[PDB]
Amino acid sequence: FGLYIHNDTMRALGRPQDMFSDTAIQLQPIFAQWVQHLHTLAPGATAPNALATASYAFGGETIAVAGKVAMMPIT
Amino acid sequence: TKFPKFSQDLAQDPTTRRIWYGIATAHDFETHDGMTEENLYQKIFASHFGHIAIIFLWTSGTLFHVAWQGNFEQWIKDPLNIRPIAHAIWDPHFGEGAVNAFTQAGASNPVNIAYSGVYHWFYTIGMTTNQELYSGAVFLLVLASLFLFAGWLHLQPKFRPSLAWFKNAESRLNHHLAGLFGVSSLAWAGHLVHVAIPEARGQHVGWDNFLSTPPHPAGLMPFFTGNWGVYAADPDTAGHIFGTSEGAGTAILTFLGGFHPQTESLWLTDIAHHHLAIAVIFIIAGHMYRTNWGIGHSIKEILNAHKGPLTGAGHTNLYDTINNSLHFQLGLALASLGVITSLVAQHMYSLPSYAFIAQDHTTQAALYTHHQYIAGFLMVGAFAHGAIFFVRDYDPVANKDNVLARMLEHKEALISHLSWVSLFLGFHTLGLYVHNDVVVAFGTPEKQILIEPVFAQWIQATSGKALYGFDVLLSNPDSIASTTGAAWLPGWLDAINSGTNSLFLTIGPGDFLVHHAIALGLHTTALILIKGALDARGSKLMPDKKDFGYSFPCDGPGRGGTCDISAWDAFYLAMFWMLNTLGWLTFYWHWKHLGVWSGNVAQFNENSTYLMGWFRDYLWANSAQLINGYNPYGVNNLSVWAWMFLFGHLVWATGFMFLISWRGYWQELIETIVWAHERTPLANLVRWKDKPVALSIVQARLVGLAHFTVGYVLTYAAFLIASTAGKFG
Amino acid sequence: MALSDTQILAALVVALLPAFLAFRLSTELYK
Amino acid sequence: LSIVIFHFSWKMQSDVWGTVSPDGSVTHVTLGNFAQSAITINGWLRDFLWAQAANVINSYGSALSAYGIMFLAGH
Amino acid sequence: MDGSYAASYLPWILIPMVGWLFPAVTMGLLFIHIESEGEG
Amino acid sequence: DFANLTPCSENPAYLAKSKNFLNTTNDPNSGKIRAERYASALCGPEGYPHLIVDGRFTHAGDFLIPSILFLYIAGWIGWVGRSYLIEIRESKNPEMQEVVINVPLAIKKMLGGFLWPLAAVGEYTSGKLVMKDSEIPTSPR
Amino acid sequence: FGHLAVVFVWLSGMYFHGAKFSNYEGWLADPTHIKPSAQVVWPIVGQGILNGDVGGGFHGIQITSGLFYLWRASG
Amino acid sequence: ELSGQPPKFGGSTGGLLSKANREEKYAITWTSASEQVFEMPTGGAAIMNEGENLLYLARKEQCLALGTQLRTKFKPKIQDYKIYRVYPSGEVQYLHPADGVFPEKVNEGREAQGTKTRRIGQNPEPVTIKFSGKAPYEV
Amino acid sequence: SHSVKIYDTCIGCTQCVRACPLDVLEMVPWDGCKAAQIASSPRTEDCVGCKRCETACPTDFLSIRVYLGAETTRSMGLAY
Ligand code: CLA
Ligand code: CLA
Ligand code: CLA
Ligand code: CLA
Ligand code: CLA
Ligand code: CLA
Ligand SMILES: CC1=C(/C=C/C(C)=C/C=C/C(C)=C\C=C\C=C(C)\C=C\C=C(C)\C=C\C2=C[C@H](C)[C@H](O)CC2(C)C)C(C)(C)C[C@@H](O)C1
Ligand SMILES: CC1=C(/C=C/C(C)=C\C=C\C(C)=C/C=C/C=C(C)/C=C/C=C(C)/C=C/C2=C(C)C(=O)CCC2(C)C)C(C)(C)CCC1
Ligand SMILES: CC1=C(/C=C/C(C)=C/C=C/C(C)=C/C=C/C=C(C)/C=C/C=C(C)/C=C/C2=C(C)CCCC2(C)C)C(C)(C)CCC1
Ligand code: SF4
Ligand SMILES: [Ca+2]
Ligand SMILES: [Cl-]
């Protein structure tokens, strides 16, 4: 929460380069990204008989039933 | 430990509570160790000297920051399109965006825009230069020096005075009503006719040319010889430009009942006429009580002389009741100050008297909200100190069968009837509001229940305003009060019938519904405060409450449970209802003034009758510029108000912690934290001097209430200032 | 016109006097 | 759980849900504002609470107006 | 930060004095005082 | 009188809205009879009807009739409850009939409340309505 | 056993409201033109506005519990 | 001196802190006919020895809660426990039961302290005792 | 320490003494009631202020009254 407070104060003070964000001081969830990557390379390497991934939220392509979205990679 | 010096019971306390209670009981002078009444009064007198010096240093600082870092003369040139500057910002935390955003109002440095009305007040009193502000700031510095030395000297031996002059009520009240009230009013009327009107009609009246200038062509002599109507020869015309000689009159005491067309403030000459008349009445009322010669009244005799058939002792021994109780005196003073602060708020928005303050919408909103908040605080304090009087100072034998003990006698009737009328008001206001909301939501807003405020519109009609067709009293052209000459009447009719002022605004059923909501809030806050004051001494659940004092946590879970049974707790409960009522009134005032100032009164007239209109068209709509004070695309000058808005939300919710969670959970949690510190290597070298404990039950309620109130105030102040300065300022 | 640097420093030198007097009053009120 | 479901609602409207073009591009519901607005409390207040409450408060006179009424009623 | 007003070095010196030096000195003196086991 | 408002049939916002008043019930004429009923009221500039509670007899339907009907019904409810509480006080367990309600005597009083203000003034004049201050329990004053 | 009876009463009411006062017929032939609606509300006191147009000449509250999708998944 | 075997206990975090060696601790001694398990007032279970048992606790209330458990939660009721206060200088002050008889039963030689010869409602007014430093119940 | 006072409406039911978890109260012989015993508080320095004795008291407007006063390590119930 103090990271949120830091960000509110630095944005209010006109210091966006001092915030915690992707365009600033980065806090990348690298372990969750690595696990998402491993789930993306699962179907064929560590899950050989599995055709597609367990969920496209881990990584893949966007299912576009009708004009609407159903699931995409949640970055 | 030593601290607190004044409480050995708290000084022996080995916990952190000591420090907290040493903070909270420092100004409860009576409960200090070894306190007599004499030293109590002398210490209070010195603290009053210190407080007066603090107020004067606050004013000197206001003057110094207007003079040093403000734009006062630039605002003098154009006081309708230049924002006043409070002081300069020196914050090393600012980025380039905030530096550019707060470099506003023509400044070359980051500044804050003043909203206290300060520039309009020093324009209306004839100050035009920063050098005068600096000279006055140095003058208030040396005046505060004199008051601080006076306090120190009157704490010395051979200058510490007795107990007799403190209880000398007649001489002190004559002195305050004459020398402090009437003489000061006379001196301010002298300042008005000597500076304010001759600076409105452009001229320089400084201290150098103070000796030789007549305010009027015919001088003091027609004041002495006879009729003063010479001072009503020619008022300022309706083409007058403030601060110049164009359209200028020479008369210094007239009346036409209304506003000067340019500044849209009260006529300065009319203000002077009022002030001289009020000073004369204050001089007259100041010769009403006895002195060292023996012609005036003694207040005890008048109090003892008033009785009645069905009232018992009447007003017997209330002189010694009020004169020996500082809490009764405080209650009366706080109640009077709160009522007149509410009067100040309700008059200055509707009858402004400062030059061009009526076009400064955010300033007017800030002033009205500030004074109504101060009034709510003072009224709650009045009822709280009346409860403290009943706990500590009330003598049931000396006050037997008078009005005080009779109010004690039928206290159940008062509390039950207040409860009934609060239930009445709340039931029917909520029923009408919810009915309106439901039938508006069902696509059919014509089955709403809408009552015209007919009595309030008739009160509007019987003052000059003719927009309703009642045609009675001053609206009626042929009525007796209308045909009296009385040259305030046509100007007053023009001021109350032109719809460009806040003077007697037109009202619909939304005004009526929110007035009954305001009535409910006033009645319920009074019910809580009155029940607390009248059960401070005892109730059927706790008849020895006066032995436990004003403030104590409870009487335990026994006898069914007794949480929040003290009168302090009723003060604490009534704080919430006072804030609720003040929020309701400020919401109504701000939404009406946003409708009036922008010209779109139809939004209030068709949406205030149901609560979704209040939710959407007032709260949701007017936050949009506030919450965009900072965003991912940048900042503007409302960045500080967005941050303070969020800060107030946080402080309010932090108060919810102490209000909802209670002590014993926290005491057990702190016990585990104490264990953790006592077993951690390299931190066992560090020991606390006071044992960490949880906050007390009363401390928990007080701390949660303080956060609740601070968050309430800061949130609404941020919203009010940001919405009005984004829409208009 | 604006004030001078010497005006501001003279005001602070003046403000040294109520500072000392407030110290004296608070010390006397403490006992 | 209020924070969990607020995170879910904002992330699904910002980076998942929306309308797919026939060319293969997706226009999201709140146009990807979660990466820059959900790092501040003010962004949560303005872009999530204030912005998305416009549907529940401008529901009166329609079939969604009951959701307006409960929006008052819970309050 | 800068100022066009007279003696603009005075906020430069006094904002850290009123923000850091004065409160640290005041809380240090007050912490030494409120824990003084002198007499009572 | 009431110059700031207008009769509804003259206020053109009222006609422009009452041309399209929605039918609340399954009757298609419901909006039309709503318009016919609301045309005789006093409408504001927005077109919605406004009610006057000053005490005008022509505005008796605005305040006077539903208020006196509510007073009659509220007196019926209060007198039925009060007479039930007076009657069940002289029993072995008056708390039991307060929590498991004796149906027939309650029904006998329910079809007995059509003469309530005469009974109220009779009980007031016979001393059966108001007790003394010394008779009732009081908190320590 | 009493709790299981209560849950069975609730589920029976859900199936009854999905069969008599619903548009499962009509939604099933055309999924993405018609939203699910399984509650029909009487016209009284103006509350018939809540019977909104959901598709195929139906007037009722758009149900969001997902009963139609599970019923389609069960055949 | 204080005699008794310590009850066999695995140790717990709820026991004595630095107040025990700094300000005071408390001791409870009791005789037990058999070896059975009791509940520690600081959390957990301990086993009391056959014969004399001496337990050290942080507060008097913990010792008295243990004594209440001894009198009420055992089929042979242990009614002979003694509770003492132990100072870091080594002086042991006997606390409970002070006269050898449990305080719910009367005993001659007990002096009435904290007893008031007036009723609860005849305490005097606070306004009668202003600037005296004493409460209505202390006069 | 807190103050525990016993007033003359005491009827010697010993319930306040049984309810007290810190051994503040005893029962001493008396003559004002049929039980011929009155509660006493010799050990108010061990009183924590829990008011269990007040909860146990059956006389209307209780014959035992606890007044919270000066706070000590014993009175705040501190094990540290
Ligand atoms: C990290 C957050 C942060 C911090 C620390 C500051 C710090 C500061 N800001 Mg600031 N600001 C911030 C964020 C922050 N800002 C943001 C996000 C915005 C929005 C863009 C602003 C907008 C802003 C403006 C517009 C202004 C400041 C100003 C100031 C300065 C005030 C100093 C002062 O007058 O005396 C110190 C503070 C006080 C006297 C306040 C007293 C309040 C406390 C609670 C009273 C406690 C009393 C109590 C009895 C305690 C005992 C006393 C103690 C001595 C022992 C200070 C340097 C002002 C400035 O430049 O000063 C001239 C100013 O005008 N700020
Ligand atoms: C005539 C001589 C005189 C004068 C001028 C004063 C003046 C004062 N005495 Mg004092 N006193 C006197 C004789 C006098 N005394 C004598 C003879 C005795 C012996 C009996 C006392 C005994 C005495 C005691 C025991 C105490 C005082 C106190 C005070 C101070 C009151 C606080 C204050 O400033 O309120 C000023 C209030 C006003 C100027 C007006 C009140 C409110 C008005 C009516 C409403 C507002 C007006 C207007 C609409 C608002 C304008 C807005 C503005 C921004 C432009 C004040 C300085 C108290 C004090 O503070 O001690 C230092 C105190 O405790 N006096
Ligand atoms: C002229 C006005 C006046 C005067 C002389 C007094 C004087 C007194 N009052 Mg009183 N009172 C007043 C107004 C006044 N009050 C008002 C307006 C209210 C209603 C709110 C009260 C409510 C009240 C109660 C309920 C009680 C008193 C008590 C007392 C006595 C002891 C005060 C004490 O030690 O408090 C100690 C003072 C403090 C601990 C200060 C806390 C207040 C802080 C400064 C406010 C918070 C500021 C905020 C956090 C700043 C941060 C903001 C930033 C983050 C932006 C004393 C006789 C008490 C007493 O002894 O009664 C028996 C008591 O119980 N008064
Ligand atoms: C929105 C919040 C809210 C509401 C509605 C109330 C309502 C009330 N408070 Mg209150 N209060 C609140 C917040 C609130 N309080 C807070 C935050 C505090 C601070 C702790 C207090 C502190 C407080 C005190 C200290 C006192 C009150 C009193 C009152 C009563 C005044 C009578 C009245 O206004 O009209 C009547 C009531 C209403 C308008 C509200 C109830 C109406 C309902 C909605 C009707 C429908 C009921 C429904 C059919 C029930 C069926 C339930 C079913 C669905 C299961 C009333 C019950 C006073 C009192 O008791 O006076 C008699 C009193 O002394 N309150
Ligand atoms: C009480 C009124 C008051 C207030 C609220 C302020 C507020 C402020 N002053 Mg300021 N000032 C004042 C009086 C006041 N001044 C007076 C009377 C003088 C002498 C003429 C000055 C001289 C002054 C200078 C030279 C500077 C400020 C600055 C500032 C800002 C930062 C704080 C600082 O560094 O202070 C420093 C203040 C001083 C060194 C002078 C002491 C102030 C007075 C004499 C003490 C008042 C004490 C108070 C009344 C006691 C009660 C307080 C309460 C908490 C109990 C801030 C906006 C700085 C600024 O402009 O930042 C942009 C700056 O450089 N002030
Ligand atoms: C209201 C007063 C105030 C003021 C003026 C400041 C000012 C500052 N804060 Mg700050 N801050 C404040 C209150 C304040 N803060 C509060 C109330 C909070 C939160 C509760 C914060 C939280 C905060 C954070 C989290 C951070 C800052 C930082 C900074 C600095 C940014 C630039 C820098 O790198 O400094 C570097 C300069 C200093 C830290 C101090 C320099 C002092 C001198 C030059 C060194 C010592 C000299 C000598 C040995 C002693 C002189 C003796 C005698 C003459 C007196 C800036 C000086 C940042 C920071 O400290 O960066 C390092 C930072 O990360 N602030
Ligand atoms: C009678 C009754 C009871 C007993 C009730 C009591 C005890 C009533 C007590 C009453 C007192 C003591 C005083 C009454 C004051 C009553 C008043 C003042 C007037 C209310 C206003 C009335 C008519 C006039 C209202 C304006 C006048 C006029 C009618 C306008 O168009 C409208 C309007 C609102 C301006 C119950 C409650 C016990 C039980 C019930 O079943 C029976
Ligand atoms: C020889 C003599 C007389 C002639 C005297 C002459 C020729 C002049 C006398 C003037 C006198 C006697 C008093 C003047 C007093 C002015 C005072 C005391 C000012 C007080 C101001 C205060 C306190 C604060 C003001 C503020 C300032 C600084 C601001 O800037 C903003 C507003 C505010 C904050 C209000 C007369 C014939 C009479 C009588 C016979 C003897
Ligand atoms: C608790 C207590 C207390 C307190 C109380 C209080 C706080 C109260 C308040 C009260 C109030 C708060 C009141 C008020 C009131 C007011 C009034 C009552 C007014 C009146 C007015 C009038 C009557 C006027 C008239 C008019 C008009 C309207 C218009 C026209 C003209 C004329 C002017 C005629 C004391 C301390 C005492 C005691 C102890 C206890
Ligand atoms: S308050 Fe608690 S510890 Fe004190 S005497 Fe009563 S029961 Fe015993
Ligand atoms: Ca000049
Ligand atoms: Cl943001």
Instruction: Identify the residue whose tokens are 């335990």.
Output: B556
**H17 in Cβ contact with H26 (< 8 Å):** no
Which residue from G minimizes the CA distance to B446? G46
Q: What are phi and psi of H47, to 5 degrees?
A: -115, 120
Ligand 12 (single-atom ion) residues, CB below 5 Å? D 40, 42-43
Q: Which of F71, E39, E16, I7 is nearest to B3 (CA)?
A: E39
| Four-CA torsion B507, B508, B509, B511, nearest 10 degrees | -30
What's the CATH code of the domain at F19?
1.10.8.110
Query: Is B313 in the C-facing interface, judged by CB distances under 8 Å?
Result: no
**Least Cα separation, residue E8 to chain B (angstroms):** 10
**H136 in Cβ contact with B36 (< 8 Å):** no
Q: Give the pair of three-digit tokens for residue G12.
A: 């029976």
**E11 in Cβ contact with B68 (< 8 Å):** no
**I73 in Cβ contact with I14 (< 8 Å):** no
Contacts of B476 (CB under 8 A, 6+ apart): B482
Number of domains in chain F: 1
Atom 22 in ligand 5: which residue has the minimum CA distance? C12
Which contiguous run of DSSP H or E holds residue F6?
A: strand F6-7
Chains that touch C (3 or more CB pairs under 8 A): B, E
CA of B249 to the centre of ligand 8 (A): 26
Which contiguous run of DSSP H or E holds residue I64?
A: strand I64-67
| Four-CA torsion D13, D14, D18, D22, nearest 10 degrees | -170
Q: What's the Cα-to-Cα distance from B207 to each of B133, B187, B210, B213, B652, rounded to whole Å? A: 14, 16, 5, 11, 50
Cβ–Cβ contacts within 10 Å for residue B204, how many? 12
Which ligand is closest in space to the CA of residue B424? 4
Going by beta carbons, is chain A in contact with chain I, meaning 3 or more pairs sit under 8 Å apart? no
Q: Is B422 in the pocket of ligand 4 (CB under 6 A)?
A: yes
Instruction: Identify the residue whose tokens are 């804050």.
Output: B112
Which residue from B minimizes the CA distance to H18? B678
Q: What residue type is H100 in one-letter code? A: G
In whole angstroms, what is the distance from residue B184 CA to residue B341 CA?
Answer: 19
Q: Do B37 and H133 touch (CB under 8 A)?
A: no
DSSP states of B505-557 as a string?
----HHHHHHHHHHHHHHHHHHHHHHHHHHHSS--SS-TTHHHH-S--S-S-S
Q: Give the pair of three-digit tokens for residue G52.
A: 């909104």
Which residue from E minimizes the CA distance to C10? E7
**In b/e form, how buried is each residue of I49-75, taking b as 16+ CB within 10 angstroms?**
bbbbbbbbbeeebbbbbbbbbebbbbb
Task: Tell me the domains of chain I and their CATH numbers.
Answer: 1-80 (3.30.70.20)
Q: What's the Cα-to-Cα distance from H69 to each of B507, H78, I15, rounded to whole Å? A: 73, 9, 18
Q: Which of B81, F106, B35 is nearest to H131 (CA)?
A: B35
Q: Which of B634, B622, B525 is nearest to B581 (CA)?
A: B525
Q: Give the pair of three-digit tokens for residue A25.
A: 């001081």
Q: Is F79 in the pocket of ligand 7 (CB under 6 A)?
A: yes
Residue E9 structural domain: 1-40
3-state SS, residue B235? coil
DSSP states of F27-69 as a string?
-TTHHHHHHHHHTTSEE-TTS-EEB--S--STTIIIIIHHHHH
What is the CA B346 to chain-centroid distance, rounded? Answer: 11
Q: Which of B623, G62, B612 is nearest to D70 (CA)?
A: B612
Q: Do I78 and B691 touch (CB under 8 A)?
A: yes
Instruction: Identify the residue whose tokens are 């390590």.
Output: I73
F17, burial (CB in 10 Å: exposed 0-12, middle 13-18, buried 19+): buried
Q: Mutation test of the interface with chain B: which of D33, D45, D49, D72, choosing the one with the most B Cβ atoms within 10 A?
A: D72
Q: Give the pair of three-digit tokens for residue B138.
A: 């140095």
**B473 in Cβ contact with B462 (< 8 Å):** yes
Beta strand segments in B29-97, E? 85-88
Atom 44 in ligand 6: which residue has the minimum CA distance? E16
- What letter would DSSP give residue G48? G
B500, burial (CB in 10 Å: exposed 0-12, middle 13-18, buried 19+): exposed
In ligand 4, the atom with minimum distance to the C-alpha of B426 is 35
Contacts of H133 (CB under 8 A, 6+ apart): B33, B34
Cβ–Cβ contacts within 10 Å for residue B263, how many? 27
Q: Is B191 in the pocket of ligand 2 (CB under 6 A)?
A: no
Q: Give the pair of three-digit tokens for residue I80.
A: 């540290």
Q: Do B93 and A14 touch (CB under 8 A)?
A: no
Chains that touch B (3 or more CB pairs under 8 A): A, C, D, E, F, G, H, I
Cβ–Cβ contacts within 10 Å for residue F43, how many? 25
3-state SS, residue B208? coil
Residue F25 structural domain: 1-141
Q: Which of B638, B626, B628, B636 is nearest to B101 (CA)?
A: B636
Q: Is E16 in the pocket of ligand 6 (CB under 6 A)?
A: yes
Q: Which of B620, B621, B623, B619 is nearest to B584 (CA)?
A: B619
Instruction: Identify the residue whose tokens are 């048992």.
Output: H53
Cβ-Cβ contacts under 8 Å, B108 against chain E: 2, 4
In the beta sheet, which residues pair with residue I27? I39
Dihedral (CA of H138, I1, I2, I5) sign: negative
Chains that touch I (3 or more CB pairs under 8 A): B, H
In whole angstroms, what is the distance from residue F46 CA to residue F21 CA?
Answer: 15
Cβ-Cβ contacts under 8 Å, B545 against chain I: none
Number of domains in chain E: 1
Q: Do B145 and C18 touch (CB under 8 A)?
A: yes
Which ligand is closest in space to the CA of residue B331? 9
Contacts of H49 (CB under 8 A, 6+ apart): H5, H7, H8, H32, H35
F75, burial (CB in 10 Å: exposed 0-12, middle 13-18, buried 19+): middle
Query: Is A26 in the D-facing interface, judged by CB distances under 8 Å?
Result: no
Q: What residue type is B3 in one-letter code? A: F
Cis peptide leading into B261, omega within 30 of 0?
no
In whole angstroms, what is the distance from residue F17 CA to residue B534 CA?
Answer: 55
Q: Give the pair of three-digit tokens for residue B4.
A: 């607190």
Cβ-Cβ contacts under 8 Å, G52 against chain D: 62-64
CA of B524 to the centre of ligand 4 (A): 10
Task: Tell me the domains of chain H and their CATH numbers.
Answer: 1-138 (3.30.1470.10)
Alpha helix (H) residue ranges in B324-449: 326-348, 361-388, 403-409, 411-441
In ligand 8, the atom with minimum distance to the C-alpha of B210 is 7
**B443 in Cβ contact with F22 (< 8 Å):** yes
Q: Is B92 in the pocket of ligand 6 (CB under 6 A)?
A: yes
Q: Give the pair of three-digit tokens for residue H19.
A: 């107040």
Q: Which of B315, B308, B200, B187 is nearest to B250 (CA)?
A: B200
- Residues tagged in the binding site annotation of I for [4Fe-4S] cluster: 10, 13, 16, 20, 47, 50, 53, 57
Query: Is H87 in the I-facing interface, judged by CB distances under 8 Å?
Result: no
| β-bridge pairing G37-39 and G61-62 | antiparallel
- What letter would DSSP give residue B504? T
| Four-CA torsion B415, B420, B422, B424, nearest 10 degrees | -170
In whole angstroms, what is the distance from residue B478 CA to residue B482 CA?
Answer: 7
**H24 in Cβ contact with H87 (< 8 Å):** yes
CA of B641 to the centre of ligand 12 (A): 13
Q: Is B181 in the pocket of ligand 2 (CB under 6 A)?
A: yes
Q: Is E13 in the pocket of ligand 6 (CB under 6 A)?
A: no
CA of B54 to the centre of ligand 6 (A): 29
In ligand 4, the atom with minimum distance to the C-alpha of B430 is 39
Q: Measured between CB atoms, which of B9, B552, B678 is closest to I70? A: B9
**Least Cα separation, residue B544 to chain H (angstroms):** 7
In whole angstroms, what is the distance from residue B425 CA to residue B698 CA?
Answer: 32
| Four-CA torsion F112, F118, F120, F125, nearest 10 degrees | -140
**Least Cα separation, residue A73 to chain B (angstroms):** 24
In whole angstroms, what is the distance from residue I38 CA to residue B14 CA?
Answer: 34
Query: Is A66 in the G-facing interface, judged by CB distances under 8 Å?
Result: yes
Contacts of G25 (CB under 8 A, 6+ apart): none
Q: What residue type is B79 in one-letter code? A: P
**Least Cα separation, residue A29 to chain B (angstroms):** 22
DSSP states of H1-41 as a string?
----BPPB----TTS--HHHHHT-EEEEEEEESS-EEEE-T
A47, burial (CB in 10 Å: exposed 0-12, middle 13-18, buried 19+): middle
Mutate to test the pocket of ligand 1, among B19, B65, B91 (most ligand atoms within 8 A of CB): B91
Q: What residue type is B35 in one-letter code? A: M
